[PDB]
A paper describes a structure:
Here, we report on the structural determination of PorX, a noncanonical RR that comprises a classic REC domain and an additional enzymatic effector domain that exhibits phosphodiesterase activity. Our crystal structures reveal that the PorXFJ adopts a two-domain dimeric fold with a classical RR receiver domain's fold and a unique alkaline phosphatase superfamily (APS) domain connected by a helical linker region. Each PorXFJ monomer adopts a two-lobed fold containing an N-terminal receiver (REC) domain (residues 1–120), followed by a three-helix bundle (THB) domain (residues 121–209) and a C-terminal APS domain (residues 210–517). All PorXFJ dimers adopt an intertwined assembly, where each monomer is symmetrically wrapped around the other monomer, forming an overall “X”-like shape.
Among the different orthologues screened, we identified two distinctive conditions promoting the crystallization of the full-length PorX from F. johnsoniae (PorXFJ) in its nonphosphorylated apo-form. Heavy-atom derivative (bromide) soaking, followed by a multiwavelength anomalous diffraction data collection, were used to retrieve the missing phase information and solve the high-resolution structure of PorXFJ. Although the purified nonphosphorylated PorXFJ was found to be monomeric in solution by size exclusion chromatography, both crystal forms presented an identical dimeric assembly within their asymmetric units. The primitive orthorhombic crystal form gave rise to a single dimeric assembly (two monomers in the asymmetric unit), while the primitive monoclinic crystal form gave rise to two identical dimeric assemblies (four monomers in the asymmetric unit). In the primitive orthorhombic crystal form, residues 358–369 adopt a helical conformation in one monomer while presenting an extended coil conformation and an additional helical turn at the N terminal of helix α16 in the second monomer. Global comparison of the APS dimerization interface demonstrates that the 358–369 helical-extended coil conformation dyad gives rise to a total of 1,080 Å2 surface area, while the helical–helical conformations dyad interface is only 993 Å2, suggesting the helical-extended loop conformation to be more stable. In particular, only the helical conformation of residues 358–369 can support the proper coordination of the Zn1 by the conserved Asp360 and His364 residues, whereas in the extended coil conformation, these residues are facing away from the APS catalytic site.
Numbering used by the authors:
A (entry chain A): 2 to 427, 435 to 517
B (entry chain B): 2 to 428, 434 to 517
The structure:
C-alpha cells in the first residue's frame, strides 16, 4: 500500500513538479486548493500525512490544522509555506506541526521529511542492530582490559548505553549476544569483588566510595557550601538503568551538577547498606557503638527503624551545625502528605527522604499479577518505573523542593538483578549461618565476617554472597524453588546491577 | 544564557552568512572544521545542540554523531549537508538525527530547526494554555445546548481532546476549569440517560449502537467482506482516553480504517455488557434462551464463563459459515502462551480474544496502595495504560496477527471512572446494585423498579436496579468511614458517565 499524502495549497497547480517527484517515489498525492474542502477529504479518507500552506484566501494553514488535529490528532501534519516570520514558526511548532519547510523547497527536503516522520522507527531498529553488530567485539576487548573499579564503572556505563538502545530491536542473535556480554561482565566483576573487597578495608587502600563513606565524602561537602538547603532522597532499591529511564523527566526541574557512581557494601540489602549510609559506620561498628539500634537477621521486626537516630548521631560526630529532618515514605498517602506540606521545611538545611516504592515494585513483580503483567522483563521494569516516577508523590516533592530553591541529592542503597540460574545450598543472594553447604564457584565465601565489617554469632558464622545472576536455592524444595524464583528481582549479592549505583547532585532550574 | 551551537563542517568558512544570521538572533556558534576536535570541544563544554556535515575528509558526520551521542545522548544533533552517497538520509534518520537540512539551506530553515528541537515543549505549553483560555467558554455554551446522544458523543470527543493536551500544563486555574467542565458534563449526561434510556428499548426507537447490537451491526459487515481473517480483541474495562494513550503505538503495526463510538448497556459491567457483546442478546433474553449459561448476581463463581458458547450460538443464529476460536486471557502466562502459538490460528476466519487489564479494585490494602501510587488520577492511569500496552503479550498477539495479514477489530465492554463522592446503600464495589430491599439516596442514582423494561432480569416484582451517577460510589453503611477512605479515588464501573458508557469500536488494516 502506497503512503497517502493530502496536499492543501491555494497554488497547488504551481507545485506539479513536486507532485510528479513524489509519485515517481510511490507516494499517492491528493491535492486540495482550500482548507474547507481539504477538511472534507481528511474526514472521508485515512491519509498517512497532510501538507499545508500557511497563507490561503479562506482558512489559513494553522486554522485548517486546528480543525484536522481535533478530528484525528494522530495524523502527522507538515507546513510548506513562503512564510519566514518567527511568530508563524512558533504558532506552527506550538500546534504540534511534525515539520515546517520554507518555500522554495528542494523536492529531496520533502522526501527527507516523509522518511523521517513515517519510517524512522524501522530505520532506527535497522541502524541500531548494525551498529551493535560492528561494536560488540570492541566491547568484549574493553571488558577483557578492565583492571580497576573506575574501569568497571566505565564498562557498566557502556553496557547500560547499549541495553537501552537495543531494548526494542527484533534480531534474537544480537539480543542474546548482549545478554552473553552482561553475563561475562558480571562473571568478571564477581571475581574482581571476591579478590579485592577485604583488601579495600586496609589502611590507605585504593577503594571506591562505599555506603559507610557516602554521607561524609559526598553529602557533607554540599552541606558545608551553605549555598542552598538540600533535599537528600534515597530511592530504595534503584538500579542504574532505572535512574537512566527518568533522567530526562528530572531535567525539566533540576540541572545535573555532579554524578558519582559508588559501590554498595555487602550484603547489597537495605538492613546493611541503607543503615551504613545513615550511620557512616559498617554494620559491625553499628552493632558495637549502637546496640540499642542495630538488629541482626535473627531479630524480630523492622531492620531500618532507626535511620533518623543513626543520621542525627553521624551529623553530631562530624560536628555539623544544621537543622535536619528525616522522612520514610512507605505508601502513596504518606508521599502525598509530605508533597502537600513540604513548604513547612523551607528553613531546614537538610531534608532526608527515603522512598520505598521501587523495592515494593521489585518483589510485587513475583507476588501481584498486576505488577507481573506490567514488569515481565527489564524493558517492562524500566517502563513501569518511568510511568511510576512521572506520576509519583516523589516527583511532586522534588517539584516543591525546586520552587523553594533546594539543591537535590538523589541516590539509592543498592540495585537488584533478574536471577536466572539456581545454586543449591543447605534472602536468595546472601545467607548467614554456622553450617552451610554451597557451590563455591557460584558464591563469595566469608568465613570471618568481622574482616569485612559484618557481625558474627560465633567463630563458626559464615556469610555467602551469590555472584552473576545465581539465586541460592534450598535442596529441600529445589524444583519448586527454581520454578518460583526464576526471573525474579533479587538483591544481597554481587553484580553491577546490585552494587554500582548512582549519586547525583542537581541545582534547581 | 544564549543557546550554544557546535557547528562541525570542513568548509565552516562558506557558512559565515548563516553564523552572522544566528548570532543576530542571540545564538552563540562555536565552529570546528573536523570531527576529532569537535568531539574534544563537546566533551569539555556544554552545547545545547550540534550541527554536522556528513562528508568530511576525516571522521564523517555520522561517525562524529556516534561518539557524541554515546557521551551525551540527550543533545539534539542536526545534519546540514549536500551528499551524493547512497542511502545517507536513511542512515542519518536511523542514527537518531533530530533534523536533516539539504544544502544550500535557507538560514530561516535552520532557525525553524533550532526552535522545533529546543523550544517545542515550552511553545506547545504556551499555545495549549492560550488556546484553552479562548476555548473553555465555548465548551461551557456547547455543554448547555447538548440535547441528543450524538451531541453527547461530540462533546465527549471535545473534552477528551482538551484533557489530553492540558494534562502536562502548569496553570492550576485552567486545570480546575477543565475538571469543573467534566463534572458538569457527567452531571448533565446522567440526567440525559435517566430521562431517555428506557425509550431506547421501544420498537423502532432512535438509539445508538449498544452492547447487544455490536457484533451484528459492526463486526458481521467486516466478516462478510471475506477480504482478510479478523482478530477481534475486547480489552476488558477500557476507557476512550486509554485507547487515545496507545493510539500512536498501535499505528506502527495497524492503520486505522474506521472508528465508531458506541454505548455500553446498563449496568456498565462485564457480566451484563460483555456477555451481551458475545450473545447479541440483552441479559433478560440470555436468561430466557440460555438458562444453562446466564448467571444472576446472587449465583456463585465466574460471571463470564460462557462467552465462547454465547458467540458460537450468535454466529449460528446469523447463518455465518466461519472457522472461529475464542480466547480469554486473565494473566501474563495465558497471554504469552497465545502470542507464542498464534500462528496455529492462520487458517481461521475469526479469532476472538478477551484481554483483561490490571485489577484496579483489590480488597488487599497492600495491592490497593500499589494501584493508587500507579493510577491516582486520569493522567497517571493513561501513563500506566501506555506502559502496560507497550510491554503486554496483547501487543505481541497483535504483531503476530499483522504478519499473517489479519484485519484488527479492537473494542471494549465499558470504561471506568475515578469515584470521589460516597452514597450510602443497604440491602461487590461496583457503581450499580440489584436487590429486592435496597435503601439508597434516590438523587444520586438512576432507579429502575421494572428491570425487564431495559432487558434486565428480575428475581421478582420487588427486584430493582440502581446505577450511580456523577462520580458517586455506593458505600455500605457497615464500616462506612473505612469503606469511604479505602474506595475514594478508585476506578469503578457499573453506573452512568461518559467514561463508563461511550466507548470505542476500531477497525484496522495490517501495515
Ligand atoms: Br472526522
Ligand atoms: Br492568501
Ligand atoms: Br477555506
Ligand atoms: Br516550493
Ligand atoms: Br564478552
Ligand atoms: Br559467575
Ligand atoms: Br572512601
Ligand atoms: Br524498617
Ligand atoms: Br555545617
Ligand atoms: Br509529612
Ligand atoms: Br502528590
Ligand atoms: Br577527524
Ligand atoms: Br542514542
Ligand atoms: Br548552505
Ligand atoms: Br466563538
Ligand atoms: Br461548564
Ligand atoms: Br442499533
Ligand atoms: Br469469569
Ligand atoms: Br459468512
Ligand atoms: Br495509599
Ligand atoms: Br419485574
Ligand atoms: Br427499589
Ligand atoms: Br450495609
Ligand atoms: Ca498561499
Ligand atoms: Ca534497599
Ligand atoms: Ca564537506
Ligand atoms: Ca555511508
Ligand atoms: Ca469489563
Ligand atoms: Ca418492581
Amino acid at each position: 500500500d502506497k503512503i497517502r499524502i493530502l496536499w492543501v495549497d491555494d497554488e497547488i497547480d504551481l507545485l506539479k513538479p513536486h507532485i510528479l517527484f513524489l509519485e515517481k517515489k510511490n507516494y499517492e498525492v491528493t491535492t486540495s486548493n482550500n482548507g474547507l474542502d481539504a477538511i472534507a477529504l481528511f474526514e472521508e479518507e485515512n491519509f498517512d500525512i497532510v501538507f499545508l500552506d500557511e497563507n490561503m484566501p479562506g482558512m489559513s494553514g494553522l486554522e485548517t490544522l486546528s480543525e484536522m488535529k481535533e478530528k484525528k490528532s494522530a495524523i502527522p501534519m507538515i507546513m510548506i509555506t513562503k512564510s519566514e516570520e518567527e511568530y508563524i514558526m512558533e504558532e506552527a511548532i506550538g500546534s504540534k506541526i511534525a515539520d515546517y519547510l520554507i518555500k522554495p523547497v528542494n523536492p529531496n527536503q520533502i522526501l527527507l521529511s516523509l522518511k523521517k516522520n513515517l519510517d524512522d522507527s524501522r530505520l532506527i531498529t535497522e541502524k541500531t542492530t548494525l551498529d551493535y553488530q560492528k561494536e560488540f567485539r570492541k566491547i568484549s576487548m574493553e571488558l577483557a582490559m578492565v583492571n580497576s573499579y573506575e574501569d568497571w564503572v566505565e564498562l557498566y556505563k557502556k553496557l547500560l548505553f547499549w541495553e537501552l538502545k537495543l531494548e526494542d530491536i527484533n534480531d534474537q542473535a544480537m539480543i542474546e549476544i548482549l545478554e552473553s556480554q552482561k553475563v561475562e561482565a558480571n562473571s568478571q566483576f564477581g571475581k574482581y569483588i571476591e579478590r579485592n573487597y577485604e583488601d579495600w578495608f586496609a589502611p590507605k587502600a585504593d577503594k571506591p566510595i562505599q555506603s559507610h563513606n557516602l554521607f561524609k565524602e559526598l553529602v557533607v561537602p554540599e552541606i558545608k557550601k551553605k549555598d542552598k538547603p538540600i533535599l537528600f532522597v534515597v530511592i530504595d532499591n534503584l538500579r542504574y538503568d532505572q535512574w537512566k529511564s527518568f533522567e530526562t523527566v528530572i531535567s525539566n526541574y533540576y540541572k545535573l551538577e555532579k554524578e558519582v557512581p559508588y559501590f554498595s557494601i555487602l550484603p547489597t540489602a537495605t538492613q546493611y547498606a541503607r543503615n551504613a549510609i545513615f550511620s557512616g559506620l559498617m554494620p559491625l561498628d553499628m552493632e558495637k557503638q549502637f546496640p540499642q539500634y542495630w538488629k541482626n537477621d535473627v531479630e524480630d521486626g523492622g531492620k531500618n527503624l532507626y535511620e533518623a537516630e543513626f543520621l542525627s548521631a553521624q551529623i553530631k560526630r562530624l560536628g555539623l551545625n544544621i537543622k535536619e529532618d528525616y522522612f520514610k515514605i512507605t505508601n502513596y498517602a504518606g508521599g502525598k502528605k509530605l508533597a502537600e506540606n513540604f513548604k513547612a521545611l523551607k528553613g531546614n538545611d537538610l531534608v532526608t527522604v527515603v522512598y520505598n516504592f521501587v523495592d515494593m515494585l521489585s518483589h510485587a513483580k513475583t507476588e501481584m499479577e498486576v505488577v507481573k503483567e506490567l514488569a515481565s522483563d527489564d524493558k517492562a521494569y524500566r517502563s513501569l518505573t518511568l510511568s511510576w516516577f512521572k506520576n509519583s508523590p516523589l516527583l511532586e516533592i522534588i517539584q516543591q523542593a525546586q520552587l523553594l530553591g533546594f539543591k537535590l541529592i538523589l541516590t539509592t542503597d543498592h540495585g537488584t538483578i533478574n536471577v536466572k540460574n539456581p545454586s543449591k545450598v543447605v534472602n536468595l543472594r546472601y545467607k548467614t549461618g554456622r553450617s552451610l553447604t554451597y557451590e563455591q564457584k557460584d558464591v563469595y565465601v566469608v568465613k570471618e565476617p568481622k574482616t569485612i565489617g559484618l557481625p558474627a554469632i560465633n567463630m563458626s558464622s559464615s556469610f555467602i554472597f551469590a555472584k552473576n545472576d545465581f539465586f541460592l536455592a534450598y535442596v529441600n524444595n529445589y524444583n519448586h524453588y527454581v520454578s518460583y524464583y526464576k526471573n525474579t528481582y533479587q538483591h544481597g549479592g554481587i553484580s553491577l546491577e546490585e552494587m554500582i549505583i548512582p549519586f547525583l547532585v542537581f541545582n534547581p532550574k
